[PDB]
Amino acid sequence: TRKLCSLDNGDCDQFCHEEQNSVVCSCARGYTLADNGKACIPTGPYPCGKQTLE
């Protein structure tokens, strides 16, 4: 039965790691973890992994 990082990536936008019995989220270089500890916010222009829209 899927728990933690196996249940929908733990609600993380990007990297999910299981510590003790809890989900810990993190983010690629160039992103900052948001205050909710789950979302990843780009710290600057042209963040990695995003198709360009301008």
Binding site: C5, D13, R29, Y46, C48
Partner: protein, 233 residues
Amino acid sequence: IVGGQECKDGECPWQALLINEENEGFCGGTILSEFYILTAAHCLYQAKRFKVRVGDRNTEQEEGGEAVHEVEVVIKHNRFTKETYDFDIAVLRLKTPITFRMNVAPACLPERDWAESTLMTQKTGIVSGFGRTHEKGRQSTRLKMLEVPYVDRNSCKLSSSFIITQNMFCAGYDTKQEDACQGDSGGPHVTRFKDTYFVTGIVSWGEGCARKGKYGIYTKVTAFLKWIDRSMK
């Protein structure tokens, strides 16, 4: 790329193209950062001197966003071997930093365990390049992309005439006519996760292109994440 679709504006911005002395593309690469291109080791032998073009989608036209960068350092995996194409991975440091802009931007490096558990278990990845549009054909003047299923590792080993090492994985289709092809080699295989694209492979080799019972063979980027880290210092 055999099949698939053109990369539309902004869609494949991490694509690099290695160009020889005749300004002709012979291999692909993935933009990792302003200074570093991921490509395949076997691509280094395809030309004595070469540069890296980024921002290009149509080789027949100068659409303004293109830029050529000279290579400063070539960092080839020391265990690369031509006979099996095992450890088929190289990083290039550029002399001048890439300026990110429309059509020019890096793919993300994932963390190993997450990538293996979560990216490489997704249904598909995406491969792209200017390579041949069918086995016997000429290279494409348009950047193409193609969704390719991950392939069960045992099927891949049974499909294959040559050894599939743990530094490789397989993707593509059993009989459907869509695959990477010659000239795409060295280019990206990325996996999307919530609208963010992570590098998961390097185009390495196939037994022809899109043959029935045959798959695309990619370098397994997650086996080399420490090594890429080191190479980028």
